[PDB]
């Protein structure tokens, strides 16, 4: 009746494959191999990789909304919405069974008390001096930090 993420009270993270363990079992550890910002290309998208560099900027901790809870003035029921994007369109009209049945036009109002939020921080990582080629300018890559 409610999204699974709403009641979750934990965060999940992946620890890269240690080089020692990979070499013990005769395997290559792509995830734990350090890379520069330049070496991160478009073919690496969607993979678990490691980046080596110097942090140049960290933003303030802000709440990022994941599940939004609404209320019906007429119905008396609660609605939920899942956010997985930069932007979202708020609900305006009730979708409950009661409302629908009865034909009652009830407006939805946002409720921040019952919503789910996660701490968000945006950081910038820049190339080290020894990683830049000859006659090149350093590059930076954005970092998104969520949870604990």
């Amino acid at each position: 009746l409610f999204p699974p993420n709403l009641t979750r009270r934990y965060f999940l993270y992946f620890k890269p494959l240690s080089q020692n363990c990979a070499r013990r079992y005769r395997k290559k550890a792509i995830s734990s191999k350090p890379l520069s910002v330049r070496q991160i290309k478009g073919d690496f998208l969607g993979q678990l990789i490691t980046v080596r560099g110097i942090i140049t900027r960290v933003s303030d901790v802000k709440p990022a909304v994941e599940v939004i809870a609404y209320t019906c003035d007429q119905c008396g029921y609660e609605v939920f919405q899942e956010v997985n994007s930069r932007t979202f369109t708020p609900l305006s009209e009730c979708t409950s069974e009661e409302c629908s049945q009865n034909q009652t036009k009830g407006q939805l109002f946002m409720s921040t008390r019952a919503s789910k939020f996660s701490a968000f921080q945006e950081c910038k990582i820049q190339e080290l001096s020894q990683q830049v080629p000859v006659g090149h300018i350093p590059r930076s890559l954005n970092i998104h930090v969520n949870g604990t």
């Binding site: 007429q74 009865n102 034909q103 009652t104």
Partner: protein, 92 residues
């Protein structure tokens, strides 16, 4: 091309409706000689308004009243029901 919701005789006669009013309307309503007249009027209107809301959320109270009026004037089944009620009470 969408059927409108109406306070039909069917509705009125359901378990949530007139039978509901008869079953539990003396317990909740109480006119007190020690209370102000406005308070008694508000209590009666409170009970009937909550019942109406439960029954037929679309309309307001006054609107509900009006609708009730028209339904009662028009519907022949409702008339039967009412008469039945009255008859059964007169037989007691």
């Amino acid at each position: 091309r969408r059927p409108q919701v109406k306070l039909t005789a069917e509705k009125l006669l359901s378990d949530k409706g007139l039978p509901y009013v008869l079953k539990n309307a003396h317990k909740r309503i109480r006119i007190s000689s020690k209370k102000n007249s406005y308070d008694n009027l508000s209590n009666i209107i409170q009970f009937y308004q909550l019942w109406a809301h439960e029954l037929f959320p679309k309309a307001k109270f006054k609107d509900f009243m009006k609708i009730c009026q028209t339904v009662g004037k028009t519907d022949p089944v409702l008339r039967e029901y009412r008469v039945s009620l009255f008859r059964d009470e007169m037989g007691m």
